[PDB]
Design a protein around this ligand. Sequence first.
Ligand SMILES: [Mn+2]
Ligand SMILES: [Mn+2]
Ligand SMILES: [Zn+2]
Ligand SMILES: [Zn+2]
Ligand SMILES: [Zn+2]
Ligand SMILES: [Zn+2]
Lengths: 543, 545
Amino acid sequence: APTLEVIPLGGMGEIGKNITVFRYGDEIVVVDGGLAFPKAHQMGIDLIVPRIDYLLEHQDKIKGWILTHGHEDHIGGLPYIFARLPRVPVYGLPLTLALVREKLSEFGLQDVDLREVTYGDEVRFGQSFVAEFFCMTHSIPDNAGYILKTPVGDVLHTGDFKIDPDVGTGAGIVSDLERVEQAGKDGVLLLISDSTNAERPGHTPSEAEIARNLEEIIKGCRGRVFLTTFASQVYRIQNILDLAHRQGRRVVMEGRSMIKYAQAAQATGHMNPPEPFLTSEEVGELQDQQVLFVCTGSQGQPMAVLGRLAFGTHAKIALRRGDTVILSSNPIPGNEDAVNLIVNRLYEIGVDVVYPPTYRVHASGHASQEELATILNLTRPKFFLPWHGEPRHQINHAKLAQTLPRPPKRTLIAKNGDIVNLGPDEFRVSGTVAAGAVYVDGLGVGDVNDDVLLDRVNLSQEGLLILTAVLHPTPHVEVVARGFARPNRDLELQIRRVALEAVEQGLREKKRLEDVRDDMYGAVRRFTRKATGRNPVLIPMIV
Amino acid sequence: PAPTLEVIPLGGMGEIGKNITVFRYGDEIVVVDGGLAFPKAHQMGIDLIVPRIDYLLEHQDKIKGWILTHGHEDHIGGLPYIFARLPRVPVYGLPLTLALVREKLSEFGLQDVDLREVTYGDEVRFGQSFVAEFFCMTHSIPDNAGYILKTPVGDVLHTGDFKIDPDVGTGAGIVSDLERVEQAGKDGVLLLISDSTNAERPGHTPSEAEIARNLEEIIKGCRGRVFLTTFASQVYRIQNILDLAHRQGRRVVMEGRSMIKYAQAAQATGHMNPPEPFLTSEEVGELQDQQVLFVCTGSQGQPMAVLGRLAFGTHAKIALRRGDTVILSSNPIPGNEDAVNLIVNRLYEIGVDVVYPPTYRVHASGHASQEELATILNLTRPKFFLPWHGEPRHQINHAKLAQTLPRPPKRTLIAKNGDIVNLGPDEFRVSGTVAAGAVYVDGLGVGDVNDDVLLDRVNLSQEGLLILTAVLHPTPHVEVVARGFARPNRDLELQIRRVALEAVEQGLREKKRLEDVRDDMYGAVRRFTRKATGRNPVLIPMIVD
RNA sequence: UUUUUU
RNA sequence: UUUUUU
Ligand SMILES: [Mn+2]
Ligand SMILES: [Mn+2]
Ligand SMILES: [Zn+2]
Ligand SMILES: [Zn+2]
Ligand SMILES: [Zn+2]
Ligand SMILES: [Zn+2]
């Protein structure tokens, strides 16, 4: 009896670079193709994309692609991925496809078979797969969950989601809980669900509540208002455009990425500015209380607009006492220091600084425990793969499932590369495939690996000494320093002596070029450690 | 034109760390504390930060003595560095504070430091102009004091670092001296200096007695071994754990050099009293799992502390397993979030039960939240106010809190390190600045690593490096060495050579000084690699040759 | 919101 | 919990 294989290639045991492979027989369907953002220890790199060794091996079996939404951790890896694979059908909702199309054009990727769907549509992949799209609210529009119908039964994938009763834009957007409930009645064999906020009790706040909170705050602001949020948070931004209009403020969209997303959102009907956007020059004609800037830089990026404002380097705008700055965002793990740096600079300028939790001006795009419980109760799945989370999230999602009236028969904590076997009464990890990370640094893809990073870490912590050692005319050593210590004549003289004394034992004996280096390298390491207590990288050199 | 008190913060203002405050009246100085600070992520490779003491060196003959409020590292960690460069003067503090400093000075070989023990209520004199009176304030370490500094212009009340804990839980009757603080308000407080750490937190910081109750409830329910980490200096927390362990039939192992160190100091000064002797890891191995509790270093995610080694499977004598419970009785300090998260995920992957806030209320801050800060402001009714021990966000929010109360201070200032704050019966202003700032410690080096050195470290960390050396003879050729730049690639290597070489050759073809030529080849390669890779590696060009 | 140091 | 891009 053939089984379905669920093979996560990214997005399990991490938050980022989501990509999930489904295989039945010799047919494959792939879902998403995200990037991930670098951690602190991954110094100097720009982004991370998934290893696609498995898809390369089985590329002839790929029948199609599903794209759940246009967040970068779901579509950011596609330029890299699609370039190495056959041009298969790629299905997605309008805003998702618009963002992908633009991204593919930057990379000069030609003839990608993008195919528009909408909620309720059924899409056939080969003989064995049918996928049905349904609406789930999230922090970007045109976000979908799906039901993948297979020979062994149905998989429901929630997508990334929250259950927001009212996103505030008046477009009637709501999660299709009716469809999800019916799926539970029809029978869900496997649930795949968003674990991001599985450790958070209660219910994620509604965007309509955040908008009310923002209007109340902004209504009370005496002068200019500056607000930062994710450029892709179309609902948040639309609601701000409407409250601004009601509060007699004109809006400036500041930052390249803000203008970019505003363009795609408008083109696909999700953004409708009640009054036209103005430039900073144009709003300069207005009184302070008539002005609102919606700005990039919610995560503390120094070169984003908020960053330049906070550091006094913005070319056309200068913050001053009386200004209000609203951070309509929470720092993502790893960005705490950067955001804090901007916050303290803002206090020092003397602006009024508004942020959570002091002011309730942000709602997560992801379901908290009550919402995750709702989906588990409605679907009543036989089997469960908590997804889109680090192990702590997945495991807490699993624990939450056990608190409910009808828990799954079995729950697994998948890792990237796991082959998860699915059948009517089968649910197990049956093996593994090649999975992992590929680093992008500038233009280069995979030229930087973990070995290289290790080097960057050593340089950063201990600094560098370059030593040119010459036996001719008489043995002597010369020194260039980087990040080791400030200039010290005393110290500098002593290190040459150590290296030159070491060539002496080498020089008096017959010494090969190679043999000498290690000996004096040992001399300096022994010495420099003695003198400074530090272990700087040294690169020996002979002319 | 009347003589004024100068309050000159040299550290601890506009930051959390390296606290040190100078009081000057005429030709007399009293100094308070000598802390270190911990490096930020951009300060790569360095171990700790100590204050610039240029001011104290200039005026060393005027220094009458020192007040040490408590033994936390951000109040005493700089003293070895500071005391070594100054005259021996009287140094006052409570017993645990002095025990910790004494040991610190011993490690450094510093001799003949004049440590003088005080206790709550003691009044000590510094020269003609200063009298300091110590009083108890609860905090996350024992023997923590605030003080009233009585000067010719009036009284300064300094809260020290504090919370208002009604019961730290150790059965020793320890409580903040709010009676004394209220009396100070009636006598008249000219200037209040208060701890702003938690000024953005509404309500009241939880009590250690509640945390102890919560820990006992959790531990009573643990089926197997329990490992717990907290700050090694959280003597109240640890003592309460010792006592609940006894009630719950578990023996205790203190693990990690630092745990043993603070336990030694706490026991020697009577703050820690284990109801049963500590055991070693070998000794508890004789016991059933549910009889065992490990109190471990590593609460901030340090990979080489005990919890770190347990989490990574590298502990030489102990191995975690499914069924173990690990409790993080702490919250990550800003900047340590990633390190703690790393350990938490490894613990989950091992399969231990992992217990931490906010899911479980197993930690209480050592510092006052807004209700407690308001209580102090209301009791002292100060004329002038210096919010302290906080970054500007904390200080400014403390100032705003003061404005909401029934009797706000006449004036509140947000001081910066190096500020000269002038204080008189009706004067409160910043009148100038003095040299202030950071000195980095890296290994044995003090001040040999500076910001210029760090900037180089950043650039190296990000872009890696390319050292290009041009050799003129016999025929000019270029040599390339890369570290942390990219994995080996011969094609690119040879391309970099030619771009450099053309500049060398073209530069020789039209005459230029060797210094001019290196610049030309640095420029060409920077232009080439940026086009080729999109990166700007650190470039070290050499023409000698 | 203070260290940690097989 | 997703980018920013004087
Ligand atoms: Mn880079
Ligand atoms: Mn170091
Ligand atoms: Zn998303
Ligand atoms: Zn996502
Ligand atoms: Zn303290
Ligand atoms: Zn402190």
